[PDB]
Each structure stands twice: as structure tokens, then as C-alpha cells.
Design a protein around this ligand. Structure first.
Ligand SMILES: [Mg+2]
Ligand SMILES: [Mg+2]
Ligand SMILES: [Mg+2]
Ligand SMILES: [Mg+2]
Ligand SMILES: [Mg+2]
Ligand SMILES: [Mg+2]
Ligand SMILES: [Mg+2]
Ligand SMILES: [Mg+2]
Ligand SMILES: [Mg+2]
Ligand SMILES: [Mg+2]
Ligand SMILES: [Mg+2]
Ligand SMILES: [Mg+2]
Lengths: 50, 107, 354, 61, 153, 63, 60
RNA sequence: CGCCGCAGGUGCAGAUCUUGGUGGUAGUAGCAAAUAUUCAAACGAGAACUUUGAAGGCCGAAGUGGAGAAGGGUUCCAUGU
């Protein structure tokens, strides 16, 4: 909602920040083994914990 | 010559008889395009927007019984198109449909 | 298909005087370059002399625009090109023995006379300048004489760059990476017909394989480096920009729109300098650079103490031998190298001339 | 031109805080250049200045 | 790459291939069997007729529920359809095949489709929603296609 | 090419609905270049965007 | 427009700007961005030109 | 891996067996609740579906309108794919 507490807004901030694709130069690292961000989240598909 | 133009009258009533209410005016334009294709032998037919208004003048189901049009075969002026000629069909407003022949028109 | 070219003999004659007026201001630059001066001072006076001289020439035809096709760029021993300090920016002081490189351009009817030169200042009368800074300028001079001799419709664009790579290897130097010569037509310094020097794999496939043509103006530009081929940025403000007429965008800023309209009045399509304005110009340039309305001409630095040199001029192509309208004051009597030329084709081209 | 804690220890509180002020000003200028494009030389100097600040503060503490 | 049925004379032959093409495998297999053995010009004309619904492909093996048509009688069959997407995809592969034939230098007015094979591709997954809280698969059936054209006249 | 933004901005500037906004069919490129409300105002002043009048709902029959 | 520490209030931001840039300030507005960074709108005094203060800062 | 001994979590068709994969069904059922679309042009490789204009309609102020609370959490807005 529009009304929210500071703690909720800070929680939503971190989830927003970490919901981004991995860098392209990560794929070039040695012994990478990482294909794509497996922890991506979409607002409509998966709802946050709160 | 292939830049001829002619005045026709179309019995829309004849071609739409039996079509449901919500499909009459759309069918009248499919049969008008069919009429131009047959009469002028061009797969590319362009309905004038004033003619489109004339067909839809009385709504989707009370299409006019007759319409007087003018088919004009023309050069597409664009060789990038696969059809050399296209027929542009326009609307001829008339007061009556009695004794109206199919006539040739000059430029 | 109606674009103007060298087909008019009047175009030829105004090229000759425009190149002469570009050469004569480089001459005043080299005769006024002394110890204890400022790069900003020489840049501002170099452009000011252009503005007043182009005003007093072709006073009979003023519907068109006469003036700068490339601002006075002055660099010393660390900058590749595209350098023009602002008044708010830090200055540089000229000392004994430093070689300074000056770029300058004039235009009439959108037709360009562009020229550069590299020269050592405060040179003692009748002496010889040696070192590893004395062979890069001599090799670059040989490159300019090479291009003057070999420019001819009937060759390929790769012939120039492979000869430049060869003379680089002969002098144990290398060309600067990503330096492009251009075909210069009316209202254009960014012609599509372009020439590369020191290519790489990525720039080669993006370069267009093309063959030269008669009756057109070229800007043969050579960049020779005595180092390794490294050109990067050191956080210096880019001053020189060029309007791109192909694109447009809706500016969101009043002072950006005022800046753009100032560009249209003075330098509508040709590269300019931010010096000509300055407080609102620095604000209005960042947004116009963001949306690709202006092409920045970035400043390039090499390793500290390394040496690079330039030599460029506008050359006219004509079937009965090309001609030169812009030349710099280089004298090979007092400039020699510790390595000589060993190639047969190079020695043949420097011996022969139009 | 780096800062070594070994040569910092002889200094006094006045000049140590002056050196901290100079480093902090430099870091704030580097953060400005980071958001205004700048160059990789200034971007990579951020870590150098940041460790220099920690070095001075460690000596002070 | 290793095809199946390598040409008897590879010099007078050209190859084309596509993988994971998002067309129905069953439709494309029927269309491929229709144009198999045809001349290059005849097959191009035929496939254009399929999209114009003037010539149909006979559905011989995958014919469950396929309707009847009059144009199936050209073939010795009763059921036929006009798969627009299969005809378009095969038309692109025929253009690619004739571009390969031009690149090899052999002429393109004497090519005959001597080999054409449609294979099943890995299935793509989607979901459909059913009556009582159930999810059921909505799998796509893409196909690989390969073809070899050999000069003969 | 796609004047969704320009129709929204023209309705907000003209204080009408998107029903009443008339973007010129022939000057499509010039309308498409307007990415700002002040550009929209310039087009309205220059006659490339017109607020169509209210549909007639006469009370003559009722009177 | 400055990005400030989330724990700094309007008084602290006002004093910090005054000390760091030696300029006066009329008022400070403050919001917290969706990504968590606090953003301050620092309106300069009428006699201080933010256009050239941005120059000496280096964000022109 | 063979031979001499030793030791087993040692042999599968079943268990509405466990897990994974794959068929026939089958190019089938189906994509049928709330009246409705049409013409022209543009962009574009490609237009029933995008955008614009022209028509014909519907919601009919207890709205398919304009705003909010809860809830969602960037879905907002430009640019591009
Ligand atoms: Mg939900
Ligand atoms: Mg059956
Ligand atoms: Mg369902
Ligand atoms: Mg359910
Ligand atoms: Mg607040
Ligand atoms: Mg067991
Ligand atoms: Mg088993
Ligand atoms: Mg069915
Ligand atoms: Mg259905
Ligand atoms: Mg109603
Ligand atoms: Mg509502
Ligand atoms: Mg949106």
C-alpha cells in the first residue's frame, strides 16, 4: 500500500536491489559454473514473504 | 487500355440476402470487393473511405439495397508490388436507381 | 546527385586561398610559439585570427558561412588529438624542446581546408634535435609524403594502412589504434568513405572495403606512436563536439536548447569548441551528448613520457595528378632518425612526386 | 605516492587529522567523478584512497 | 554435419537443415512426403499453392480427424489439408537449399528433392488450467528438418 | 508510428479526453517527434493537434 | 540534488552542505528512494547560484 | 579380468510398487458467458489483432468513468529487443 513503515520499505528495497541479472563478465571467470540468476523473482508469479 | 474507369450499380440486397444481422455490412464490403475483382480482374482492390461510410450509413444490418460505385483500374506506380494494376472503387451518390445502366467514363 | 564537388574551377581557387589562409595561421602559430606561453593563450589567439581573417575574405558572398571547420587543437607530448582547454580548466606552459602538435581548419561554402603539423619549439638556429622523439615525427613526415605521392583513384583503401604499418615497423614504432581518415565533402567532415590506421579484428570487419574515386577531397591523417599503441582517458573534459544532422530528439532543458541553437548559428554541422561560449555551455552539452545529438571528440592520453605525432592535410584528387592546398612547416635538414628506411617501395614513393 | 602506516606513526594528532581531511576530500571528489563518468584511473583510485583513510584512522586509534 | 542418407554423388548435391523449428511435426511430415522427389521449381510452386489453398497435402499417416477435400484426389487419397506454417517453413528451407546450390556452383534449374526428413525436436513446456484445480501440459511439438537436393535432368 | 504517448500528453494539455484529441494523420512523423508537453503545446498552437468539439446532444426535441 | 546517508536529517544535511561547499542553503527537502538511498533537495540561498556551484563541485 | 579363498546392501515382469522418460488416444476435445465490427494510411521483412484518421456500436453517472483504504512492491515512466 501507499502507507508503509520504514522497516517494510527497507525490506522491499533490498529485494528490489537483488532482483537483477548477473553481470556478463561473471561468465568469463575461472571455474564459473553459473549460468543465470536462479534466484530471480517476478512480482506476479512469486509473492514476497511479507 | 488498362486505365479505364466505369460506373456500375451493385445489388447489395441480392448479395447479402440471408446474412445475419451482425455480419451484413461487413459482408457487403467483402462482396463489393468481390465485385470489383471479378469486373476488373485485379486481386488488389481498394475501397474508398467515402464508400465505406455509404455502406455503413444505416448501421450494421440495414445496409442499402443498391449502391452506385465507380471502378477505376489504375497503374500501381510501384514495381515493388507484385500486382501491376489495382482497382479503386469510389462512391457515386445518386437520387434514384431506375434505368441506370453500366456506363463508361472518361478521365 | 546535385552535391557540389571540385568540378567547378571556382571551387578549386577558393580551396587554394582557404588552404593558404589555413597554412598562414599555422605559420603565425609556429612563429609565436615560445617558452613561457600558455596552450590556452595560443588556442584562443589561433581561433581569433581565423575568425577575423575569414570575415575579411569572401566579403562579397555572405549568405553562406565562412569560418572554422575544426577548432585550434594544441597538444604536447601526451595527448593524441582533440584538445582545447577551457578558461575554467587548467593551463599548460610551453618549455624548451617540447614538440607541440596543432590542428586547425577553415571552411568556405561548407568546403574544408584542414591541416596539422608537429614541431619542436625554441629550436636553436642550425642545430639537430635527436632522441626517440625525433624519429616519430620524421616517420610521420614520411607518411605524409607517402600519401601525397600515392593518393590516386585506382588503388585500394588498405594500401595506405599497410604502407603505414610497414613504415611503422621500419622505424620500430606503431600507428595509433582506431584513427580514421575521412572523405571530406560539402558540409561534412564525417564522410562515410573512411580510411583506418592500426586496425584490429573488431575495427576491420566494421571497416568498409572501398576503392578511391576521382574529383573529391580527402583528409589523409597519420598517427604515429613511439610507444605501444595505447590511447585511453585520464578524466579530462572533452571540449570538441560535432553536430549530428541525421538524428534529432526533444530536449527537456531550456539551457540545452539555447546551447543547441547557438551551435546552429555558428557551427551548425562542423566540429566546434566549448571555448567559444561557457557557464551554461557546460550544462547544455552534457544532455545533448547523452542523446547522441553531438559526437564527442574525446581526448586521448598515452603512458607518461611517451611520444606521439600527427600529420594531416586536405588533398585534392584529380586525374592529372593530385595537388596540395595545406602544408605544414617541416624541414628534413634539421630532423634525422637513428633508423633509416629499408624498403624498396617506400624509397621509390619518397623519391617520386607529382 | 602511497601512504604507509610505518611513516604515519611519527606524526602528531594535528597533521594526522589534516591528512585524514585531505584524503576524505579526495574520496568525495572521486565519488563525484564516478557518477559523472570520469575515467578508470579515477575509478580505481577510489580503493586506494579508501585504504589510505583506514590506514590513517588505524594509526590514530 | 552428419546427415542421414548422404548423397550418392556429393558434388552434384546441396544440403539444407533446420533445428528446433516451431512448427507442428505431424503437419510438416505430411508436407515433406508431398514434396519428396519433386523438382525444385515444381515444389516451390506447389508449396505456394498450399498457402493459397489451391493444392492440398494428403494426410496419410497422421490423419485422425482430418477432413476430406476435393483436391486430395490428385493424390491417391481422401483426406488433405493446407498447412500454411509447414509450407512457409519448407519454402524458407528450399530457398536456403538453392542458395547453397548456387554457392557450390551447380545450377538450380535441375535440382530434385532426393531426400527430405522431419525429426521430432525437444518438446517445449507450457501450462493449461483445468476444471478442479488441475494443471495439465500444453507441450509444443517442434521439429528438425533436413533435405538434400541432387542435380538430375 | 506509435502515438500513444502523444495522445496521452495532448489530452492532458488540452484538458479533454482522448476521445477529443485529433492527431494529424498526415503529419505522423512530426507528432511522433514531440516527447514533451511543451512540444505538444507547440503542435496545438501550430494546428497539428485539435480538440474536437463535443458531440451534439440537442434539447430542442425535449423543449 | 544530493544522495545522502539514510540516517542524516535535514539539519545535518544543511550543515554538511554548508561546511563542505562553503555555500548557504535556504531549505532542504528529503525523500527515501525505493532502493533505500536517501535523496535530498538542497535549495541554495537566493544569492548563491547552483549553476556554478555545480561547476566547482564537478557535476555540471 | 581369469584361477584359489574370503565378504555381501549380490540376480526382478508384477507389489493401484518408487523415481525419470516415452507412446496410443490425437493434430483429437477444444480455444462458444456479458450485441461488433469496417475502410484507408503509416511504421515494419512480415498486420484480422500495433498507431493515426474516418465510420458503425457498446458501457449509459448504482459506468467498462474519475479517485482512494487493505493487499501487491516497482507492476509507474521513457528508450530499445
Ligand atoms: Mg496473485
Ligand atoms: Mg478416430
Ligand atoms: Mg481451463
Ligand atoms: Mg483454482
Ligand atoms: Mg517527507
Ligand atoms: Mg537387495
Ligand atoms: Mg521393471
Ligand atoms: Mg477441433
Ligand atoms: Mg472456438
Ligand atoms: Mg447504450
Ligand atoms: Mg473506476
Ligand atoms: Mg506501462
Amino acid at each position: 500500500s501507499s502507507h508503509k513503515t520504514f522497516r517494510i520499505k527497507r525490506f522491499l528495497a533490498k529485494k528490489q536491489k537483488q532482483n537483477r541479472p548477473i553481470p556478463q563478465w561473471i561468465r568469463m571467470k575461472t571455474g564459473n559454473k553459473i549460468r543465470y540468476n536462479s534466484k530471480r523473482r517476478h512480482w506476479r508469479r512469486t509473492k514476497l514473504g511479507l | 487500355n488498362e486505365v479505364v474507369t466505369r460506373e456500375y450499380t451493385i445489388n447489395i440486397h441480392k448479395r447479402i440476402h440471408g446474412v445475419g444481422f451482425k455480419k451484413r455490412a461487413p459482408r457487403a464490403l467483402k462482396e463489393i470487393r468481390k465485385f470489383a475483382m471479378k469486373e476488373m480482374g485485379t486481386p488488389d482492390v481498394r475501397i474508398d473511405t467515402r464508400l465505406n461510410k455509404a455502406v455503413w450509413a444505416k448501421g450494421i444490418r440495414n445496409v442499402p439495397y443498391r449502391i452506385r460505385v465507380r471502378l477505376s483500374r489504375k497503374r500501381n506506380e510501384d514495381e515493388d508490388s507484385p500486382n501491376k494494376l489495382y482497382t479503386l472503387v469510389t462512391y457515386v451518390p445518386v437520387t434514384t436507381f431506375k434505368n441506370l445502366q453500366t456506363v463508361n467514363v472518361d478521365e | 546527385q546535385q552535391e557540389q564537388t571540385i568540378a567547378e574551377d571556382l571551387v578549386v581557387t577558393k580551396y587554394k586561398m582557404g588552404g593558404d589562409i589555413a597554412n598562414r595561421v599555422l605559420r603565425s602559430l609556429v612563429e609565436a610559439s615560445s617558452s613561457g606561453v600558455s596552450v590556452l593563450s595560443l588556442c584562443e589567439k589561433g581561433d581569433a585570427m581565423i575568425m577575423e581573417e575569414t570575415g575579411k575574405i569572401f566579403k562579397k558572398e555572405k549568405e553562406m558561412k565562412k569560418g572554422i571547420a575544426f577548432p585550434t587543437s594544441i597538444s604536447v607530448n601526451n595527448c593524441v588529438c582533440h584538445f582545447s582547454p577551457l578558461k575554467s580548466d587548467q593551463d599548460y606552459i610551453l618549455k624548451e624542446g617540447d614538440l607541440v602538435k596543432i590542428d586547425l581548419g577553415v571552411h568556405v561554402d561548407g568546403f574544408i581546408a584542414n591541416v596539422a603539423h608537429t614541431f619542436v619549439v625554441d629550436v636553436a638556429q642550425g642545430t639537430q634535435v635527436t632522441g626517440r622523439k625525433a624519429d616519430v615525427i620524421k616517420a610521420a613526415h614520411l607518411c605524409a609524403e607517402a600519401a601525397l605521392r600515392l593518393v590516386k583513384p585506382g588503388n585500394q583503401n588498405t594500401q595506405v594502412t599497410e604502407a603505414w604499418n610497414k613504415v611503422a615497423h621500419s622505424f620500430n614504432c606503431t600507428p595509433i589504434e582506431g584513427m580514421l581518415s575521412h572523405q571530406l565533402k560539402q558540409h561534412v567532415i564525417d564522410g562515410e568513405k573512411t580510411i583506418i590506421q592500426n586496425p584490429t579484428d573488431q575495427q576491420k570487419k566494421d571497416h568498409e572495403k572501398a576503392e578511391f574515386e576521382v574529383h573529391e577531397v580527402y583528409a589523409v591523417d597519420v598517427l604515429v606512436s613511439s610507444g605501444e599503441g595505447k590511447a585511453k582517458d585520464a578524466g579530462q573534459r572533452t571540449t570538441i563536439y560535432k553536430r549530428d544532422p541525421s538524428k534529432q530528439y526533444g530536449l527537456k532543458m531550456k539551457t540545452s536548447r539555447a546551447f543547441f541553437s547557438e551551435v546552429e548559428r555558428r557551427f551548425d554541422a562542423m566540429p566546434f569548441t566549448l571555448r567559444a561560449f561557457e557557464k551554461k555551455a557546460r550544462m547544455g552539452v552534457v544532455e545533448c551528448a547523452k542523446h547522441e545529438l553531438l559526437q564527442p571528440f574525446n581526448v586521448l592520453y598515452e603512458k607518461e613520457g611517451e611520444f606521439v605525432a600527427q600529420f594531416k592535410f586536405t588533398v585534392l584528387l584529380m586525374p592529372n595528378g593530385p595537388m596540395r592546398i595545406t602544408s605544414g612547416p617541416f624541414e628534413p635538414d634539421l630532423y634525422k632518425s637513428e633508423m633509416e628506411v629499408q624498403d624498396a617501395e617506400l624509397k621509390a614513393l619518397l623519391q617520386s612526386s607529382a | 605516492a602511497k601512504i604507509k602506516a610505518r611513516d604515519l606513526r611519527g606524526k602528531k594528532k594535528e597533521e594526522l587529522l589534516k591528512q585524514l581531511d585531505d584524503l576524505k576530500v579526495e574520496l568525495s571528489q572521486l565519488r563525484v567523478a564516478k557518477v559523472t563518468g570520469g575515467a578508470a584511473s579515477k575509478l580505481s583510485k577510489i580503493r586506494v584512497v579508501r585504504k589510505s583513510i583506514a590506514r590513517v584512522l588505524t594509526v590514530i586509534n | 554435419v552428419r546427415y542421414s542418407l548422404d548423397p550418392e554423388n556429393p558434388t552434384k548435391s546441396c544440403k539444407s537443415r533446420g533445428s528446433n523449428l516451431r512448427v507442428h511435426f505431424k503437419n510438416t511430415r505430411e508436407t515433406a512426403q508431398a514434396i519428396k522427389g519433386m523438382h525444385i521449381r515444381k515444389a516451390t510452386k506447389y508449396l505456394k499453392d498450399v498457402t493459397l489453398q489451391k493444392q492440398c497435402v494428403p494426410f496419410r499417416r497422421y490423419n485422425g480427424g482430418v477432413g476430406r477435400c476435393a483436391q486430395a484426389k490428385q493424390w491417391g487419397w481422401t483426406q488433405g489439408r493446407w498447412p500454411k506454417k509447414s509450407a512457409e517453413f519448407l519454402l524458407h528451407m528450399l530457398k536456403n537449399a538453392e542458395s547453397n546450390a548456387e554457392l557450390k556452383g551447380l545450377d538450380v534449374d535441375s535440382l530434385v528433392i532426393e531426400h527430405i526428413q522431419v525429426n521430432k525436436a525437444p518438446k517445449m513446456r507450457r501450462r493449461t488450467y483445468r476444471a478442479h484445480g488441475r494443471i495439465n501440459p500444453y507441450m509444443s511439438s517442434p521439429c528438425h528438418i533436413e533435405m538434400i537436393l541432387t542435380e538430375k535432368e | 508510428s506509435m502515438l500513444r504517448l502523444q495522445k496521452r500528453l495532448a489530452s492532458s494539455v488540452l484538458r479533454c479526453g482522448k476521445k477529443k484529441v485529433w492527431l494529424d494523420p498526415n503529419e505522423t512523423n512530426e507528432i511522433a517527434n514531440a516527447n514533451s508537453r511543451q512540444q505538444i503545446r507547440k503542435l496545438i498552437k501550430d494546428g497539428l493537434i485539435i480538440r474536437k468539439p463535443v458531440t451534439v446532444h440537442s434539447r430542442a426535441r425535449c423543449r | 540534488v544530493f544522495i545522502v546517508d539514510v540516517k542524516a536529517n535535514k539539519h545535518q544535511i544543511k550543515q554538511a552542505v554548508k561546511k563542505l561547499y562553503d555555500i548557504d542553503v535556504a531549505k532542504v527537502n528529503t525523500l527515501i528512494r525505493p532502493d533505500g538511498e536517501k535523496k535530498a533537495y538542497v535549495r541554495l540561498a537566493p544569492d548563491y547560484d547552483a549553476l556554478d556551484v555545480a561547476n566547482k563541485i564537478g557535476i555540471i
